[PDB]
C-alpha cells in the first residue's frame, strides 16, 4: 500500500511510503548473503568518478539467481523479502531437491506459488523459458541479452518487456525505454512483470531520506565559480551559455550513444 505520513513534523509532511505487509519481517537467508563494498563513487585510483555517491545505510548483498538455469525442477516461493540492493523485491524459492535461491519477485507471485524454469515450463508468471518457447505478445522480465549470461533487461520494480515479434534466430523486444531491440531467441526471459510497481509512488519527503540511500547533494554548475564548472560565474544569477556537463559537453539534447558494435541489434531507438 502507498501510505501518506501525517504532517507531525515538516520533514514528514510530504513523505509517501510504500508499505508491503507481505515482505518477510525477519532476517534474510544467510547462505545467499555476501558483503557489499561501498565506493563513495571512487574507483581504484581513489578518485571520484561518479559524483553524488556516499554514505547511506550498510547493506548485505543477496545473491539473486538471474540465470534461472535450474531447469526441470519445480520450486515453491517460501517468502517475499526486502532487498536493499534493488528496487524490486526478491522471493526466496525452495527447489524440490532442497536447494534455496532468490529470484526477482514478479508481480502477483506469493508464498506457496510454484515456479519452474526450462523449455517445457508452463507459460505462467515466475516461470523462465527461452524466448523461442514464449508466445509472441507475452510480457516478460529478467530478459537475457546473450544465451546463458543471465537476465539483464527489465529487472527494476514494475518493469517488463513485450515480445513483439519472432523472426528466425532473433526475437524483437519492446523495452521499457520504448526502444525496439533484437535479442537471440535462445535467450531466457521470466514471464510477467517485475513486482513492486508502487516503488515509483514513494516520496522521500526530506533531504535525509536521500542521504539514507547513499545519495550526496548535487551542486548546480551555475552556483560555482568559472574555475569549477563551465556554468560557474556571474555577479548575481547569470547564465548566458549552452548548458553543458562539468566537462563541457552539451547536456540538453546532444546524443552520446556511440556503439557501432551493437547498432545491428537496435531496430528502433526510444525517440
Amino acid at each position: 500500500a502507498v501510505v501518506k505520513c501525517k504532517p507531525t513534523s515538516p520533514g514528514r509532511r510530504h513523505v509517501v511510503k510504500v508499505v508491503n505487509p507481505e515482505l518477510h519481517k525477519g532476517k534474510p537467508f544467510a547462505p545467499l548473503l555476501e558483503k557489499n563494498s561501498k565506493s563513495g563513487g571512487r574507483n581504484n585510483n581513489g578518485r571520484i568518478t561518479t559524483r553524488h555517491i556516499g554514505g547511506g545505510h550498510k547493506q548485505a548483498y543477496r545473491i539473486v539467481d538471474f540465470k534461472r538455469n535450474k531447469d526441470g525442477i519445480p520450486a515453491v516461493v517460501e517468502r517475499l523479502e526486502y532487498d536493499p540492493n534493488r528496487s524490486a523485491n526478491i522471493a526466496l524459492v525452495l527447489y524440490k531437491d532442497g536447494e534455496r535461491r532468490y529470484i526477482l519477485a514478479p508481480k502477483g507471485l506469493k508464498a506457496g506459488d510454484q515456479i519452474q524454469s526450462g523449455v517445457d515450463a508452463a507459460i505462467k508468471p515466475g516461470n523462465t523459458l527461452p524466448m523461442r518457447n514464449i508466445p509472441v505478445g507475452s510480457t516478460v522480465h529478467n530478459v537475457e541479452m546473450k544465451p546463458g549470461k543471465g537476465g539483464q533487461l527489465a529487472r527494476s520494480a514494475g518493469t517488463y518487456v513485450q515480445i513483439v515479434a519472432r523472426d528466425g534466430a532473433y526475437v524483437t523486444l519492446r523495452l521499457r525505454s520504448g526502444e525496439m531491440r533484437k535479442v537471440e531467441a535462445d535467450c531466457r526471459a521470466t514471464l510477467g512483470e517485475v513486482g513492486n510497481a508502487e516503488h515509483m509512488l514513494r516520496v522521500l519527503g526530506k533531504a535525509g531520506a536521500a542521504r539514507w540511500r547513499g545519495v550526496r547533494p548535487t551542486v548546480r554548475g551555475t552556483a560555482m565559480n568559472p574555475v569549477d564548472h563551465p556554468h560557474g560565474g556571474g555577479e548575481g544569477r547569470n547564465f548566458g551559455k549552452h548548458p553543458v556537463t562539468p566537462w563541457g559537453v552539451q547536456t540538453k539534447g546532444k546524443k552520446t550513444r556511440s556503439n557501432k558494435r551493437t547498432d545491428k541489434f537496435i531496430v528502433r531507438r526510444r525517440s
Binding site: E34, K35, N36, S37, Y61
Partner: peptide, 6 residues
C-alpha cells in the same frame, strides 16, 4: 568479476 565472493 571481484572482492566480495567474486
Amino acid at each position: 568479476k571481484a572482492x566480495r565472493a567474486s
